[PDB]
Design a protein around this ligand. Structure first.
Ligand SMILES: [Ca+2]
Ligand SMILES: [Ca+2]
Ligand SMILES: [Ca+2]
Ligand SMILES: [Ca+2]
Ligand SMILES: [Ca+2]
Ligand SMILES: [Ca+2]
Ligand SMILES: [Cu+2]
Ligand SMILES: [Cu+2]
Ligand SMILES: [Cu+2]
Ligand SMILES: [Cu+2]
Ligand SMILES: [Cu+2]
Ligand SMILES: [Cu+2]
Ligand SMILES: [Cu+2]
Ligand SMILES: [Cu+2]
Ligand SMILES: [Cu+2]
Ligand SMILES: [Cu+2]
Ligand SMILES: [Cu+2]
Ligand SMILES: [Cu+2]
Lengths: 306, 306, 306, 306, 306, 306
């Protein structure tokens, strides 16, 4: 029987450590595909397909976006994916950071390993592309961010965070688990690109609710901040912008190629990027897609400066 | 009782003077938030929320986009905002050009001053973000462009213009002023991102009608032209392009970071940018968003070369 | 009476030869506007307005996107357009690569020549803008790509291809040719930006069907690949991305201005660009817009690496 | 009767203040041409022609190289030159930092003003070019350094110093002042480019003797150091290098154009340049021209790191 | 019997025409090696070995430096060298602009052709390297400048000039032509690098004497000036500098690689370079090597600004 | 008693292996200071002070320039210097590649280790600076080249070589070893900068004599060649140039900062640099300082292309 948890919100501080090395290495991460029911919005239970990071023998939590992977250019990257036994649909990986870096569909219970070399630096998206239906798998929340830093790592910053944006089309009733009163993917609404809710880090109120990481992204005044951003979509890009903030550096792919002083950057679906800004002003600031009516739909977050 | 004027179209030549100085200064502008009824489209009266520039004791006209602000990097910028006495909803400022450069909601009648230092160069958007509902306030037309030029100013050009694009969702009847037969904002159409009309400089026929600035943007052949462009949205970006024209320089944020020879540039909502092109061909040329069915809806302008 | 052919799919290998010269020249191409009925999707006949390239006395085939034009910066470009006698609506050219490079509407039967100098390098779109209704003419498939290479030509690559993306709004019945059972343009669906099908190179299954250029784009492992890409629209841009591939170079307009290591690039409607990537991984790879539900609608292609 | 002082050594710390402004200004300096007898080397009295800086009503000391002038690009530079009453030969100015920035020969007693605009940034040499014999006038020590910093000034550093290198050809006996037992310029040795002594800051032991600025150039470990360097010549350039030090930045003329990590830089006679290096190692370090036998001849200084 | 002419001074305006083409071509020049007696200095007859340019059937004059060659990058360069019948020593060519671009020693009377492709842009020196003794042949004045401009040519300028610097060691008596009372090369003085005279364009007073090209280099105020400079040596480089002038651009080899705002540039012997400066100041200005005692020896020229 | 060998010529192919790693390491080299008598020129025995590289238990040969050291930026460099027991004067190291990277004078017999971090990339000189008389120690031949390559190493080339230039002042008789008939350093000639011989790699005929490395530097046509060059001096720089060759890249200190297409580059004494060129022409080519009378004095080498 399916697990039913409060939410799949991803902490935007659960980030691997900064890179200060030039020696290539074999970086290795353990992932587990987890089908879960949880609140998408307040009062709305949704059937999620998520990624969870396994450390040692311990696993979870299940989140949207998935766990942030972090490596250096020239490293060898090993992702062990497991498909939980209590899942329904099969799953697999697809890393934009690698050349032909896709796994083969693994059945619930089986576990396979994906090995690939990260030979192009940048922020990339990774996702579930199983059954040749990447649309359906991403739509349910199976997407995360991988960053390949250059040799020596990116310029050091005071605080760093991770945000994944996505849109959701909800149909009441789940085909499986009919006992559960909650929503399932809507093909029609999805095909028509007419979403109901927008989410930052897997929840409509995530980054807006103190209980659900509402004060999670907080920085001291005068700090340099870096933001690893993904647009999971699966259809709508993000006109990303933070109120009262100016992006000193913006690079979608390479550190060297960037625009200075961007206010709002269009991040297309299925793409990741890096934002850099100094927190020169104190107080609360609203993180939002600048398609503003999107914000009421949940494209709304909160940055704190002390 | 509400004022009812023909239109809120903004002259795309009402531009402050070019900057040729390196001495920082305290540049100061007087704004007044003005709720007005006027033609959005021919035969359609709409309830606008606009910005107007006050010179000396004289104010107006009320326009969309709002008045262009123009400063140098390192200047100190002072905006005195006034909320007219005959307004309904409260208002405030939000400048993308400044760090935590937001005012506090001022009530109809009261007047506050916003002081901020412009320490990042570029073209930025400013707007009304009052009542924590920037979507509603921008949707009614409360958006304008500010440019922070580098020290010495941008490279001199023969002719310069100012264009703000926006989309509108209209509901017949205004909740207030029921006597007026005209349209008010539609939450549903707005939330669904399905606009009825598109406008350049606050009117569907603005830049297309000789009476309403139709021949306003005219330049001599062989001239260098610069265009300060804003995408007010509040939801739809602009695939900006001018027929028979090639953009020699395009920079969304910094002068140094630009692409040469762009044909169509995506300007996301809540963003401003600078276009530069030589008028090497004579005659009439259609300024349009390149989502072409948008053009019938009003995303259509006119450039004249003599 | 109208011609009725199986499809208007464009071979993504029918490309002019690479440029290795610095001597400017007068490059000349013969085009013929061809109204045709053909399969848009399997089982759906659509009324197309296309461009065809005339070599010597021989013409055709009629395709979407139109024939790729290819010149050097400083060349003199001569396009002879002919409007077939059995056409209905008038037509003309509009080249984004030239300054005021638009023809005048030519009637079915008449033939005019467009001469222009290509003095800005880059990948550009060209299209039919006749009757002052570029939306209607582009919507029916009258769009192609022109590239102006720098002097010496772009860096040489092993394999090169040409892809035009577009979206379609279909209404059953053609106003003309009522005898034909097939679909015509839908103003309403088009104005609302709610397309039914998406196409790569003029067909929903083109680049997916072995019969219809399905294995057309095939390259040997370790090859450098260049892709000339257009977004015909006429309303929807393309979040272009190829699965298992990383773009080493991406330039929308100038060769010099580009971003390294892009995964997904937003190509706005009415714009063309150049993608460059090494085929370091073997096997099949899905070419798609990353608005993934678009892929089921036909935004789906196939790249083969041996 | 001539003045006879111990030495004309220039303190390499008597430097104007750093520039942190972008507002152009009229910077003004008062100079006085001073013929003096002093020790060139220990036990060798030489007849010097020097420049001295007049502050307020007070003047002196007389030094080689002359006083460092320091301005910003776009400033207006005013140099009042005075030729002392007890001088013999006439004198004038010649600034490499200005376009046609030469005075006219002023007679002993008379005083003229040189006004010029500094519209090209960089480190330049200035000198006495009177009587159309710049060789004779420079040979006697009439040379100094002027730097035109960019707007905003050069990047700030912890410690800054000023060094002028020169070579000397000495003939016993002065034509004038026969009573004095000391040396005068040797035409023959000078014409043959065979100097006897080399000097840093006007003395053979200057920068080597604690009494004569020997510990004058001292910096704390980990400090950033900037060095304003002139090669007075008048015939021999300087293969400038500091032992145990690496120049992180070296620019002869423009800040932007520089080589990173230079060990020894050739500074041609009649040229000035800027060296930048971090003092990462403690202890004493020998400043020298790398024509090493030059060092015994006096091309030898001392840098201290604590 | 040997010819005896007044001087071998080269007009610094006898320059080929500017290049405004990108089409490679086969540029061809006819040279004739001419041994001549003439004034090196006033009252001093010297035995010169020079190059002369043959146009059509007409040849001469014989000059130092030799005739300026001027081509575009990618051209094919053909130099027909002739060794006059009344010469003594054999001669040949050696172009620094070409890969293995050396002729074979041609005997007096015989004529050979040198063909080479100019595939690296820049200013280069060419000279006589015959008998494996390039020192002896260059010492007598057999050196000239070749420039390979990029495709399109260098940026256009108002006025352009050509200057070759050299030093001379003179021995009274010529081994051949004993009847002539004049000077021949001195091995000892030459080997010891102790020259007697310095020359600009083959004469000590050339560029200083109105009769001998003294007012030859004259430009209008506000003009852009370009200078093609060679350092023939054969031993001493030139600390080139023009009084009252600042070099806006200086490139020894490639147009792209240059330093801005140089005052004095060291040009090593056997090297050529390009100087660029605006003539913003009127009047007379002294062109000189900044080894100033060199100027009395003849390293002295004259620039006029009106 | 002193050793007496034929010559101290250094093989310009005895070069450490190319670097293809980014992992910092502790690179370690064993040096031994060796006083030796040998032929400077044919028939002239000179008293040399040289460096020799000790591999394992085996040492020698003794050469000028000393052994080439080769490391990566960020490595830790360990040089064990030994002063042979049969030496007279004490010795020490001085690396331009390190911050305060000087040893203390070690007595004949004693052995010390120099540890330093190479944190600035480039080609540098190292030498003996013992007894505070670097002039005397370098003059006798105690100088070599160290290169700090960037992470990943310099771009790979087909063939690589090592050349050290120097000048010599010789006095007959050695103060020590009076039995030996040969020459010792001349203070006077040295102080006056009037050298007798010039040498490439420690011998006048080295690189010119088949027996003494005359055909040592040989490369196949079409090969890319890199040259690590030092100017030991100790007084005269090198106007380095190779006949029939063009330097595609020239960097004195940093790989990034370089000039393209240099013909002759001035390398000041006490400096090292990197030259890069393609061997597009076959046959013999003369390597020389372009102060051509220097070539007869021994500044003459030989490059072979097959
Ligand atoms: Ca990315
Ligand atoms: Ca902007
Ligand atoms: Ca383009
Ligand atoms: Ca300078
Ligand atoms: Ca050159
Ligand atoms: Ca170096
Ligand atoms: Cu899945
Ligand atoms: Cu993807
Ligand atoms: Cu408002
Ligand atoms: Cu905003
Ligand atoms: Cu048409
Ligand atoms: Cu178009
Ligand atoms: Cu004087
Ligand atoms: Cu000077
Ligand atoms: Cu000759
Ligand atoms: Cu040469
Ligand atoms: Cu020693
Ligand atoms: Cu040294």
């Amino acid at each position: 029987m399916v697990d039913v948890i409060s939410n799949v919100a991803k902490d935007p501080a659960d980030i691997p450590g900064r890179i200060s090395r030039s020696c290539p290495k074999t970086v290795t991460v353990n992932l587990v595909a987890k089908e879960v029911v949880a609140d998408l919005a307040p009062g709305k239970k949704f059937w999620f397909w998520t990624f969870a990071e396994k450390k040692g023998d311990t696993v979870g939590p299940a989140t949207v976006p998935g766990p942030m992977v972090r490596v250096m250019e020239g490293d060898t990257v090993v992702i062990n994916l497991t498909n939980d036994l209590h899942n329904e649909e099969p799953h697999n990986l697809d890393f934009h950071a690698g050349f032909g870096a896709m796994l083969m569909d693994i059945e619930p219970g089986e576990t396979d390993t994906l090995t690939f070399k990260a030979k192009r630096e940048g922020a990339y998206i990774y996702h579930c592309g199983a059954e040749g239906m990447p649309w359906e798998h991403v739509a349910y929340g199976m997407y995360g961010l991988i960053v390949v830093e250059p040799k020596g790592g990116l310029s050091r910053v005071d605080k760093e965070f991770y945000i994944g944006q996505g849109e959701w089309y909800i149909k009441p009733g789940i085909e499986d688990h009919p006992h559960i009163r909650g929503y399932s993917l809507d093909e029609d609404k999805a095909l028509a690109e007419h979403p109901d809710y927008f989410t930052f880090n897997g929840h409509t109120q995530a980054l807006m609710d103190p209980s659900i990481y509402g004060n999670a992204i907080t920085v001291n005044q005068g700090d340099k901040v870096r933001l690893f951003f993904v647009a999971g979509g699966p259809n709508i890009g993000s006109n990303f912008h933070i109120i009262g903030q100016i992006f000193d550096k913006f690079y979608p792919g390479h550190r060297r190629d960037f625009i200075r002083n961007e206010e709002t950057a269009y991040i297309p679906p299925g793409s990741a990027a890096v934002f850099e800004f100094k927190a020169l002003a104190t107080g609360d600031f609203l993180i939002v897609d600048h398609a503003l009516f999107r914000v009421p739909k949940g494209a709304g977050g909160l940055l704190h400066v002390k």
